[PDB]
Amino acid sequence: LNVLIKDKEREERQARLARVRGGTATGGAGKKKVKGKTNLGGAFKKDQDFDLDGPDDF
Amino acid sequence: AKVHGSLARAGKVKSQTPKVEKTEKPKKPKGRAYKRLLYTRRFVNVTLVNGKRRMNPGPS
């Protein structure tokens, strides 16, 4: 049931911030920005040095 | 030493896991046909590649 609650709130949160053009509710008035996520890959879990260095960058 | 403990907590996480029901899938073929589809996904159709072939790519 708790998972149901969490998922439902997630879907509703999509709906409210559909109308509002930018980031968080109230937009540019808000003073609070919308955060993003760091795509780490698998680099830093149980942190160490990286044996697999990348030769070239797209 | 500490041979006693809190035996009341046994099965805590296994009871706390939310029940997620399995989706129903089409049947996989069995036998020579399954080796046929594995051969086809590995050798002729190498559609997914990153310059190195991976079998279970996480979404990049």
């Binding site: - | 036998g31 020579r32 046909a33 080796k35 046929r36 594995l38 051969y39 086809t40 590995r42 050798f43």
Partner: protein, 184 residues
């Protein structure tokens, strides 16, 4: 009590279970020859290991040796007869250089495909198994049959089957029954 039945095991699993090169090799073999598990490839590598061990035991013997002459000629004869060993290469050193694709080309599955009665190794497998195939005048439903290279001329459809004629089959007779039912 009665004399015990002899039996022996016909394959052997490899020593390291998980090695990526050997896995990709055996999957290429299974896909190209239409095999169902790795036990068939292990069976052929076991048979080839036994042939190589006998040839290794004879080549340590000097030439003109009566055992080497007798059993080398017999082993060479059995290999050239089943068609794993070519007609020119008949010198017991070519025997050592054999590999499992030489044995795998001689199965009835790949021979039915090469003769062109099949259109696939997988169609060849199911054609053999469902008894529409006859290597002499006798039905064979074993895909690992190892045809003997004067039997290659005689692989053809079974007389008591469709595709060799004289009665169609269950689903064809049912559909004809429905169309004759609708006519009357």
């Amino acid at each position: 009590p009665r004399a015990p039945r002899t039996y022996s095991k016909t394959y052997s699993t490899p020593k390291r279970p998980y090695e990526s090169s050997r896995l990709d090799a055996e999957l290429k073999l299974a896909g190209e020859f239409g095999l169902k598990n790795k036990k068939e490839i292990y069976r052929i590598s076991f048979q080839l290991s036994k042939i190589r061990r006998a040839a290794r035991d004879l080549l340590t013997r000097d030439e003109k040796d009566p055992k080497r002459l007798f059993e080398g000629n017999a082993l060479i004869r059995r290999l050239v007869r089943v068609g794993v060993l070519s007609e020119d290469k008949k010198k017991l050193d070519y025997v050592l250089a054999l590999k499992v694709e030489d044995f795998l080309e001689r199965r009835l599955q790949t021979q039915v495909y090469k003769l062109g009665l099949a259109k696939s190794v997988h169609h060849a497998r199911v054609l053999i198994t469902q008894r529409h195939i006859a290597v002499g005048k006798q039905i064979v439903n074993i895909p690992s049959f190892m045809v003997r290279l004067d039997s290659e001329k005689h692989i053809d459809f079974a007389p008591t089957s469709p595709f060799g004629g004289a009665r169609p089959g269950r689903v064809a007779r049912r559909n004809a029954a429905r169309k004759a039912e609708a006519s009357g």
